[PDB]
Amino acid sequence: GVFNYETETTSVIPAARLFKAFILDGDNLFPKVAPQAISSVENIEGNGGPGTIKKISFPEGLPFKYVKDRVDEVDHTNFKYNYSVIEGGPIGDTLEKISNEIKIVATPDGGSILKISNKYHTKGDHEVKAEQVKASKEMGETLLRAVESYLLAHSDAYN
Amino acid sequence: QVQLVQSGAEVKKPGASVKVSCKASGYTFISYNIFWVRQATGQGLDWMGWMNPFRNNAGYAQKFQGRVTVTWDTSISTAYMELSSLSSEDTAIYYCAREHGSSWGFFDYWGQGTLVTVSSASTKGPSVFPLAPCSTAALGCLVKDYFPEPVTVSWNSGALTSGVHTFPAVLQSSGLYSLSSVVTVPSSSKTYTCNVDHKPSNTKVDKRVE
Amino acid sequence: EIVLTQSPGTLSLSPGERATLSCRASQSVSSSYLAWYQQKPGQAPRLLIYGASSRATGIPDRFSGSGSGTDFTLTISRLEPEDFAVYYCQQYGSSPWTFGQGTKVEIKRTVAAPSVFIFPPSDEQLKSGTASVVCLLNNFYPREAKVQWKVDNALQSGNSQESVTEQDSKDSTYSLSSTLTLSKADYEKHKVYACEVTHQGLSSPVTKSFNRGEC
Numbered sequence A: 001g002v003f004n005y006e007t008e009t010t011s012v013i014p015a016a017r018l019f020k021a022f023i024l025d026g027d028n029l030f031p032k033v034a035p036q037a038i039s040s041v042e043n044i045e046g047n048g049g050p051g052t053i054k055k056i057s058f059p060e061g062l063p064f065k066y067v068k069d070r071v072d073e074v075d076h077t078n079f080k081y082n083y084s085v086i087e088g089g090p091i092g093d094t095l096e097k098i099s100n101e102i103k104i105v106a107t108p109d110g111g112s113i114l115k116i117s118n119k120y121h122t123k124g125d126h127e128v129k130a131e132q133v134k135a136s137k138e139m140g141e142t143l144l145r146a147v148e149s150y151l152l153a154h155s156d157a158y159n
Numbered sequence B: 001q002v003q004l005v006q007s008g009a010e011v012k013k014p015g016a017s018v019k020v021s022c023k024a025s026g027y028t029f030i031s032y033n034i035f036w037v038r039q040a041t042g043q044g045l046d047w048m049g050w051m052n053p054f055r056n057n058a059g060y061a062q063k064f065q066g067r068v069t070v071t072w073d074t075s076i077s078t079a080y081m082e083l084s085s086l087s088s089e090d091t092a093i094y095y096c097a098r099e100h101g102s103s104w105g106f107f108d109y110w111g112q113g114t115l116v117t118v119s120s121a122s123t124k125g126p127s128v129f130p131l132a133p134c135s136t137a138a139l140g141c142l143v144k145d146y147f148p149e150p151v152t153v154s155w156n157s158g159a160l161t162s163g164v165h166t167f168p169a170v171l172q173s174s175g176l177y178s179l180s181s182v183v184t185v186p187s188s189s190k191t192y193t194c195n196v197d198h199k200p201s202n203t204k205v206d207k208r209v210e
Numbered sequence C: 001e002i003v004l005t006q007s008p009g010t011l012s013l014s015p016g017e018r019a020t021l022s023c024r025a026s027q028s029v030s031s032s033y034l035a036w037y038q039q040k041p042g043q044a045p046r047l048l049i050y051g052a053s054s055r056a057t058g059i060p061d062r063f064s065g066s067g068s069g070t071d072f073t074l075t076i077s078r079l080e081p082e083d084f085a086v087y088y089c090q091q092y093g094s095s096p097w098t099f100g101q102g103t104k105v106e107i108k109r110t111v112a113a114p115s116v117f118i119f120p121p122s123d124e125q126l127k128s129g130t131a132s133v134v135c136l137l138n139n140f141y142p143r144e145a146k147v148q149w150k151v152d153n154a155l156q157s158g159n160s161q162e163s164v165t166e167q168d169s170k171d172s173t174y175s176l177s178s179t180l181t182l183s184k185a186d187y188e189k190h191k192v193y194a195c196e197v198t199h200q201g202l203s204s205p206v207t208k209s210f211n212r213g214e215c
Helices: A015-024 A026-035 A129-151 C123-127 C184-188
Strands: A002-011 A040-045 A053-057 A066-075 A080-088 A093-107 A112-122 B003-006 B010-011 B020-027 B034-037 B043-051 B057-060 B066-071 B078-083 B092-099 B109-111 B113-118 B126-131 B136-146 B152-155 B165-166 B177-186 B191-198 B203-209 C004-007 C011-013 C019-027 C034-039 C063-076 C088-089 C105-106 C115-119 C130-140 C145-149 C160-164 C174-183 C193-197 C204-210
Touching: A015 A026, A015 A093, A015 A129, A015 C204, A026 A040, A026 A129, A053 B136, A066 A093, A066 B203, A080 B003, A112 B113, B003 B092, B020 B034, B034 B066, B034 B078, B043 B066, B043 B078, B057 B066, B078 B092, B126 C123, B136 B191, B136 B203, B136 C011, B136 C115, B152 B177, B177 B191, B177 C130, B177 C160, B177 C174, B191 C105, C004 C088, C019 C088, C019 C105, C019 C193, C034 C063, C063 C088, C063 C204, C115 C204, C123 C130, C130 C145, C130 C184, C130 C193, C145 C160, C145 C174, C174 C184
Parallel strands: B010 B113, C011 C105
Antiparallel strands: A002 A112, A040 A053, A053 A066, A066 A080, A080 A093, A093 A112, B003 B020, B020 B078, B034 B043, B034 B092, B043 B057, B066 B078, B092 B109, B092 B113, B126 B136, B136 B177, B152 B191, B165 B177, B191 B203, C004 C019, C019 C063, C034 C088, C088 C105, C115 C130, C130 C174, C145 C193, C160 C174, C193 C204
C-alpha cells in the first residue's frame, strides 16, 4: 500500500535564503555542518537537478551504512523540492521506496516554514514502524538547525 | 538515446577566436555537466573547461590560461566553447563530453570531434611530381605545397588499388602540406597515372608516371 | 595533479591473446575512481570499465578492470580485431581530473624486411628550384626502422621528414616514406644520393642510391 506522513517545522531564515542553502547546497553543507549525522554526500549521476542520483553515507556507529536518493523535481520559483529514497537504508523487505516533497513557505514574521511530506510505498498490506517515521523527522530537524546555525553565524553566506 | 553533435571544421588565422558548439539531445540538458577536451596528436587528451548548467557556474583548466570561455543556451540544449587567441599550437580536434555525475566524473557520452586548423597560409593547390626509379618496381607521385588538407589520390581513375600506399601528409616548415602516394607493380610492365584532387583549391591534376 | 602513467607505450599481441594494460598514478586514487576509454583513429573515445572494475553499458565481458590505490589494470581476456586501438585511463578521485598518455594495442606478425626504393627528383621539380629525393620502405614489421640520408657520404640531419601508414588491413605491415628536401643549387653540387635503412628484419643496412648525372 501507500502511506503518507507530513510534518511542518519553523525556521527564522527567510524562504529565498533557506532554499538556496538547505536545498540547493544541502548536499555540500550536510557533511560539514552536521558531521554527526552525515559523513559524506556523493553524487552518482547528474548535476543535482531532476534525474540526479546521490549516495549519502552515514558516520560509524550508523543505523544504516548508506542510502541512495533520486532528485525528482527542483522548482526554484515555488521553493518546492521532490526526491525519492530508492536504495539502501530502510529500502528492502516490505518497503519499496520513499517519495518526499519539501515546500518552503514564507511566514508573516520574516521566517519560513517547511512543509515536509513523506510518502512510503509498502508491500501489500504491510505498515511502517513508528520509529522509521520518527527517525526521518529527527534527521530533518537536526540538519535544518545545523544549517540554520551556519547561516546565522555567517551572515554573508547565501546573501 | 543520448547524442552530442558538434559544429564542423574551422579554419582561422592566428590571433583569431573560434567558437565550437555542442548540441545535446536525448536527455535533460540542465541535468548533466559538459566538459571540453582537446586532442592534439602531440600529446593525448587535455581537459579545457567545464560548464554546470544547473548551478550556473564554470571551471577552467589552468594550462589554457583563460583563453577558454564556456557558454550555453539551455533553450536549444547547445554548449559553446570559445578559444580566444588562436596560434598554430591550437590546431587540434576538440571534443565535448557529458559528465556522468558531479562526483562520478566519467564522460559516458562523447561528441564526434571538431577540427580547428590555425595556420597562416592561403588556399593553394599542390604541385604533383612523378616518382620513378633512375621483379618488383615502385612508382609514385609527390603531392607538395598545398593548404589546407587533404588531397584524394587515385591511380588510373581508381582501376589500380592493389599495392597502393598513400601516406599521411606532413606539415612542412613553410606551413604547406606534402605527401607521397606510391604503388608497386611487376617490372615486366602499361601506363600509370595518379589522380590528385585538392578540392579546397579546385585543383584536379592527372599525372602520368613512368 | 595526479599524473597517470600508462605502460607499455605500445602493446603488440595476436588476436585471441590476453592483454594487460597498466595505469600507474602518482597519488592514491580515492574509492578506485578510475575509468578506461577506447579510442580508434579518427573516432571519439568510448567509455569502458569505470569505478576501476565496472563495465559501461554495451561493453562485452572480455573487458575487465582491477586495482586500487596507485595501480590499476585493464584486462582484455581475448583480443579480437575490433580490440586493437589506443586505451586511456582517467582518474576522478581528486580534482583536477587527469588522463593517461595512451597505450596502443597493436597487431603482431612475423618480422618482414622492408622493400626499399629510392626516387630522384623530377625535371619538373628542378625547374622550380627545389629538389625532393624520396625513399620508400614497403611492407615491414616491426614498425621501428631507421632511415639515413647520405649525400656524397655526408649524413643529412634535419632536412628530411618521414611518414608512416597505419598498419595494413591484409598483411599487418607498415610502410614508410622519407623525403629529403634540398635546394636546386645544393642538388647540382653533389652526385651520389643514398638512402640507408636499418631494420630488425635486416642483417645489414640496405643502401639504395643513384647518381645525379646518370638519370
